[PDB]
Ligand binder design. Structure first.
Ligand SMILES: *[C@@H]1O[C@H](CO[C@@H]2O[C@@H](C)[C@@H](O)[C@@H](O)[C@@H]2O)[C@@H](O[C@@H]2O[C@H](CO)[C@@H](O[C@@H]3O[C@H](CO[C@H]4O[C@H](CO)[C@@H](O)[C@H](O)[C@@H]4O[C@@H]4O[C@H](CO)[C@@H](O)[C@H](O)[C@H]4NC(C)=O)[C@@H](O)[C@H](O[C@H]4O[C@H](CO)[C@@H](O)[C@H](O)[C@@H]4O[C@@H]4O[C@H](CO)[C@@H](O)[C@H](O)[C@H]4NC(C)=O)[C@@H]3O)[C@H](O)[C@H]2NC(C)=O)[C@H](O)[C@H]1NC(C)=O
Ligand SMILES: *[C@@H]1O[C@H](CO[C@@H]2O[C@@H](C)[C@@H](O)[C@@H](O)[C@@H]2O)[C@@H](O[C@@H]2O[C@H](CO)[C@@H](O[C@@H]3O[C@H](CO[C@H]4O[C@H](CO)[C@@H](O)[C@H](O)[C@@H]4O[C@@H]4O[C@H](CO)[C@@H](O)[C@H](O)[C@H]4NC(C)=O)[C@@H](O)[C@H](O[C@H]4O[C@H](CO)[C@@H](O)[C@H](O)[C@@H]4O)[C@@H]3O)[C@H](O)[C@H]2NC(C)=O)[C@H](O)[C@H]1NC(C)=O
Lengths: 196, 207
């Protein structure tokens, strides 16, 4: 039994739906039926949905149960238990740290190419639950990738977000904004601009 | 009962000719009534007998951990030689065969860009040096920092991220004191990849 936490961006963005996943493995053919009992801080709920079983290569079934949760509950540190084996996960306990957002312009050597990369460094935050978005002139970007949180030496986490845009746009003096959402932020939001 | 895990050699060991690459075969969940584990290594079918097996290791969950290490050649691993680890045990119905090799696919040369600290970060006593490595394949890579010949220690590298063009990218952040950066010292970002010239690429960064 494995109890996975909701996606970091799903617990911050109200437009998405955070889910707690309970993956059960090594299920026997003699006993395929698996009963799931979810508990939110003790109180038993019944709004969980179970996905159809999938036979693995090692002749075992893989039963997965999904429980949709609220954004406020997880952020406040609600205790979620999965009774199959009784696993239990929750929000990362510990003193929250404010992230430091730094936007970085493309390297001079990258100007030789047709497309440049915009860098947004976010460091010194806790916990690792975070969401990063890019936007330009109000309209959001789509061609960007963000690295998973990395545990730094001081106990906090950090990551990077790379936006790829045409060199023409960057040379025309356009303004790109790096949006960061985190628990220990004012209004759970911080933004930094970047232009030539 | 017992499970077998075959680990690939360190990326920097297969590229640096001074280091020694080795394929590790880790066996867990070994019964106390049968700690006898047989290892059989095969290189593209041909069985080798130069492996070095370490004695058993008692774990906290009342199980043993037998580890077999096989040193390999740099040219062999890079050419895509297939390495097989046959594990035999009395508690096993049939010998378990795990098999690993170099990640198949056409190699791509990584592009290394060093980025100076932000202006806002200059307020702090510790600034961050950024190294961007993008457009490489496969994900097997190694990144290191150095200054004045001597290597740095206070840095961290993000795991490779699959980009939109099918290639991988990552970042490496070096944390130095602002006094060093303002003194005019030079910091270099060392990158080791199989698609690079002499499997090495380095870019410098200074104020
Ligand atoms: C009894 O205890 C032992 C020992 O565990 C220890 O004791 C217990 C009591 C606890 O306290 C533990 O916290 C403690 O560690 C248990 O043995 C464990 O068994 C599990 C499996 O059930 C193993 O998990 C695997 O881990 C590997 C990665 O292992 C590296 O990283 C670990 C930290 O992340 C580290 O602890 C390991 O030592 C090892 O470290 C690496 O070592 C090599 C060489 O030694 C070195 O070169 C590396 O640099 C170094 N790396 C690091 C980070 O240190 C993980 O890869 C495995 O994932 C595979 O298997 C999964 C299914 O189990 C699957 O989901 C994955 O996708 C992946 O599957 C493979 O994927 C590859 C592609 O990548 C594919 O090619 C393969 O075909 C595919 N194979 C399969 C089978 O799917 C896996 O998660 C633990 O490592 C192991 N512990 C140790 C110390 O080895 C034992 O289970 C306990 N018994 C009971 C009954 O509970
Ligand atoms: C029969 O086969 C089953 C299926 O295994 C699969 O098929 C085989 C052929 C191989 O391809 C495997 O690679 C593959 O997984 C086995 O089930 C597996 O059991 C093992 C443990 O027994 C599980 O390993 C555990 O993995 C956790 C992380 O799992 C995520 O990441 C995986 C990739 O890294 C991904 O494959 C998983 O699906 C899962 O992905 C996440 O899913 C959630 C929910 O859907 C999402 O929210 C996330 O975003 C996903 N993340 C992604 C996509 O990156 C580890 O966390 C876990 O570690 C913990 O336990 C170990 C001990 O087991 C500790 O040492 C460790 O410290 C830590 O506490 C563990 O490694 C594996 O995930 C299971 N497979 C699947 C598909 O879930 C059966 O075990 C096997 N039966 C027998 C008898 O062998």
């Amino acid at each position: 039994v494995f109890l996975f936490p909701p996606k970091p961006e799903d617990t911050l963005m109200i437009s998405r739906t955070p889910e707690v996943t309970c993956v059960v493995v090594d299920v026997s053919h003699e006993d395929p039926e698996v009963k799931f009992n979810w508990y939110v801080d003790g109180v038993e709920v019944h709004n969980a949905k179970t996905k159809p079983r999938e036979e693995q290569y090692n002749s075992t079934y893989r039963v997965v149960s999904v429980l949709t949760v609220l954004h406020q509950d997880w952020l406040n540190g609600k205790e979620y238990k999965c009774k199959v084996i009784e696993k239990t996960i929750s929000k990362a306990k510990g003193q929250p740290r404010e992230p430091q957002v730094y936007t970085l312009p493309p390297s001079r050597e990258e100007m030789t190419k047709n497309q440049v990369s915009l860098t947004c460094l976010v460091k010194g935050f806790y916990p690792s639950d975070i969401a990063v978005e890019w936007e330009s002139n109000g309209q959001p970007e789509n061609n960007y990738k963000t690295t998973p949180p990395v545990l730094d030496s001081d106990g906090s986490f950090f990551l990077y977000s790379k936006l790829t845009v045409d060199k023409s746009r960057w040379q025309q003096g356009n303004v790109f904004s790096c949006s960061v959402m985190h628990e220990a932020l004012h209004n759970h939001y911080r933004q930094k601009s970047l232009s030539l």
